[PDB]
Amino acid sequence: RTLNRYEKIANDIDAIRGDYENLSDDALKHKTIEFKERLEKGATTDDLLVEAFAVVREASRRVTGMFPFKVQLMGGVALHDGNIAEMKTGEGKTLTSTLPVYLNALTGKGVHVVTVNEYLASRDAEQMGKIFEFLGLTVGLNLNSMSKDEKREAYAADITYSTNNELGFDYLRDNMVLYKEQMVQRPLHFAVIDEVDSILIDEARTPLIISGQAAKSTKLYVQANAFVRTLKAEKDYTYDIKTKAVQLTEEGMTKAEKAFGIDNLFDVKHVALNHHINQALKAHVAMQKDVDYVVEDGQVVIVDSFTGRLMKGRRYSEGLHQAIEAKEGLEIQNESMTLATITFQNYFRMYEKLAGMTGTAKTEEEEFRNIYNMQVVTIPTNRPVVRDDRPDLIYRTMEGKFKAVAEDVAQRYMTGQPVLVGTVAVETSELISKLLKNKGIPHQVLNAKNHEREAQIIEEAGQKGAVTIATNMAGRGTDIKLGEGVKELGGLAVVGTERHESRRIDNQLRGRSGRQGDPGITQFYLSMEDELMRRFGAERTMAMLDRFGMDDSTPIQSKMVSRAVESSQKRVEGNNFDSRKQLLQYDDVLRQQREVIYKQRFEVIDSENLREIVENMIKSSLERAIAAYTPREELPEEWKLDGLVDLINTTYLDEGALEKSDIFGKEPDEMLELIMDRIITKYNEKEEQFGKEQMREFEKVIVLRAVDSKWMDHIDAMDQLRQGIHLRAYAQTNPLREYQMEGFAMFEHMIESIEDEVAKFVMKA
């Protein structure tokens, strides 16, 4: 059992922090130099662990006033081992990140501390960077707004604080550079992932995708948007509430074919019109305004589903963003084109060491074992949870639930206890803010749109008589501190208003209330026309909401609706489980291909002579060109060798240098050797006249341009294959094996095209 090992190491650190206490600064900052030279002579980080942890304990008490508890040392040892430290919400996970981050930044290779958003990254960077810069290391903070030089300074520091999006995008942009000295990241060494279950379980359902702008079309967006704006929500389309899929009906298809003058919408010449009609339908019906996006400064800005904040650079793929901009009446932008793609599983499994800490890991433990080979370690609390988690108050309608929520917030405001109401969308947050505006209750709102005042709102949210309505922004890592007298009122009642997509997320909201042994109440007010119940509730229990009556002043005191609420949430969790499993194995196929391509593109970049690489490319292209003619079947002179001579003179050997007589009646390998040594002397004349390093610049540009263009086309073709592959499961094959085999064939044809393009552009230039 490892937990007794963690307790033993924590007691070791306790004895020697007795030893480390009476040391001045410049004698405690000297311990970093001492550990660095002991780590360069012969020691490992595992031998230095107790002395480094005692130095961080003393330095933290000297800087921040906090002296880490022994459960924080247990979580630090569990993070140094590469495990997942599941300390509860409020327990002190930021100091327990600073223990193994200091221990593993002494070797000089760099530690990445990953968080969920940029508020938490900047907050932790400020406080724990005060600790680390006392000790003598360097803390960079990698933000979305920085330039490449500031990012390179942030990654060159000893400890880098960033969010998971910026790490993924920096990796993807480092494999699109032309010079090696444009890469910002160092080799990936250690990642401490704060809120692991958000990053590695929840947000790992999505890939990071870097796009680049393609040509602009606008007329079909306005045409399809003007068509869909007259379309009668039940006769001409069906909106499926379960999976938010909007489809035309046969009346709507008839009206579409009449409005555009076409005869069949489902031809292969009207696939662009059908795509524009479908994306205008999804933009109108399935994408509600203040729920899914916002309109800021004449632009559609996406509100993130997990973090609940605006994603400024990010745009919807496949023409949905342009359909939303046509719907809103804004300027329709250009299309896009996927340049690079990675998932968070495949990104963080490149990291040579991976740790993590969260409050809510234990239910996902086997997933952390199957993918990341990380073991969830549960840490004690050192002070018991006095937080009061009351059961949910289920109502019939949303108007009755919101009247109850406003009445609860009103009667907690009268005593002086601070309230934090937790919604999800921006529009329900504004609805409940106007529900408290009349009733005369002064509040703050923390939406995606109110992100500028966030650090101010959180500093006032725990005062006496402080109502804060907050979306997903608050309920993940936000540390609300209680004001004077608030701990006697049982401070910070969290009033949730909906169930989220897992028990982990609403446990995180309750964790905003708890906060290390302080009192707190967490009441959830659900409803029966909540979006979780409407979308994932089973159709049996969705029939007797007339049986419960139509009053909504008192909650439904049943036990069949509580089973329905829990089963709907378990249905969402199972759907997300299978969706992230599917994305995992199919991006394992693209992960193998991408790792081959990116490793060889990098060693094209830092190779100070490319003559052997380009000559092997020309020889492989030439062997395939020889074997494309000259087949094994028709040996005696049915070999069409003047066509091969024409191909060599059009691709390799400048228009006159080969005749039929040079390769007449030859074996394929001896004509290969004849053409190959003619190619070598032509290359040597090119390298003589062209220059020596100028020739390397020339063919580096050729090779990298070919690799980039064929790899973007391969990402597109691989996406199209993954569209049709379940239809391949209709023929009683395994469709994953069909995906792997067709992806291998597609990849090898892509590499043959890379070699053909490089051979042609080098030899014929």
Ligand X SMILES: Nc1ncnc2c1ncn2[C@@H]1O[C@H](COP(=O)(O)OP(=O)(O)O)[C@@H](O)[C@H]1O
Binding site for ATP: what residues are annotated?
66-67, 72, 90-94, 479
Q: How far is the CB of 359 from ligand BEF (least distance, A)?
A: 4
747 makes contact, choosing from ligand BEF, other proteins, Mg ion, none, with CB < 5 to 8 Å by partner type, with other proteins
C-alpha 237/C-alpha 251 separation (Å) is 8
Site for ligand X in 19-78 (CB under 6 A): 66-69, 72
Stretch that binds ligand BEF, among 85-93, 202-210, 566-574, 731-739 (CB under 6 A): 85-93
Binding residues: 66-67, 72, 90-94, 479
Angle at 118 between CA 59 and CA 430, to 5 degrees: 130
Longest CA–CA span in the chain (Å) reads: 103
Distances from the Cα of 738 to the Cα of 581, 589, 717, 742, angstroms: 17, 11, 15, 6
The reply on whether position 278 binds other proteins by CB under 8 A is: yes
Site for ligand BEF in 339-358 (CB under 6 A): 358
C-alpha 311/C-alpha 318 separation (Å) is 17
**Residues 6 or more apart from 189 whose CB is under 8 A from it?**
104, 109, 110, 111, 112, 351, 352, 353
- Is the distance from CB of 747 to CB of 593 less than 8 angstroms? yes
Stretch that binds Mg ion, among 82-90, 92-100, 448-456, 613-621 (CB under 5 A): 92-100
The reply on whether position 479 binds ligand X by CB under 6 A is: yes
The reply on whether position 511 binds ligand BEF by CB under 6 A is: yes
The CA radius of gyration of the chain, in Å to the nearest whole number, is: 31
C-alpha 575/C-alpha 568 separation (Å) is 11
Q: Using CB under 5 A as the criterion, what x/- string covers residues 473-492 for binding Mg ion?
A: ----x---------------
Nearer to Mg ion, 80 or 396 (CB): 80
Among 130, 134, 150, smallest CA distance to 142 is for 150
Stretch that binds other proteins, among 263-271, 388-396, 484-492, 665-673 (CB under 8 A): 263-271
The reply on whether position 89 binds ligand BEF by CB under 6 A is: yes
C-alpha 357/C-alpha 700 separation (Å) is 43
The reply on whether position 520 binds ligand BEF by CB under 6 A is: no
63 makes contact, choosing from other proteins, ligand X, Mg ion, none, with CB < 5 to 8 Å by partner type, with none
C-alpha 104/C-alpha 120 separation (Å) is 22
The reply on whether position 271 binds other proteins by CB under 8 A is: yes
The reply on whether position 500 binds ligand BEF by CB under 6 A is: no
Site for ligand X in 505-544 (CB under 6 A): 516
Tally helices (H) and strands (E) across the chain: 27, 21
72 makes contact, choosing from ligand BEF, other proteins, ligand X, none, with CB < 5 to 8 Å by partner type, with ligand X
C-alpha 508/C-alpha 92 separation (Å) is 14
The reply on whether position 616 binds other proteins by CB under 8 A is: yes
DSSP β-bridge partners for residue 111: 159, 190
Q: Tokens for 595? A: 């790792």
State which of residues 687, 719, 760, 761 lies at the interface with other proteins (CB under 8 A): 719
Distances from the Cα of 451 to the Cα of 467, 474, 627, angstroms: 17, 11, 63
Stretch that binds other proteins, among 169-177, 476-484, 626-634, 741-749 (CB under 8 A): 741-749
Nearer to ligand BEF, 359 or 555 (CB): 359
Provide the binding-site residues for other proteins, judged by CB under 8 A: 245, 247, 250, 253, 264, 266-268, 271-272, 274-275, 278, 318-319, 335, 574-575, 578, 592-593, 596, 600, 613, 616-617, 620, 713, 716-717, 719-721, 723-724, 726-728, 730-732, 737, 740-742, 744-748, 751-752, 754-755, 758
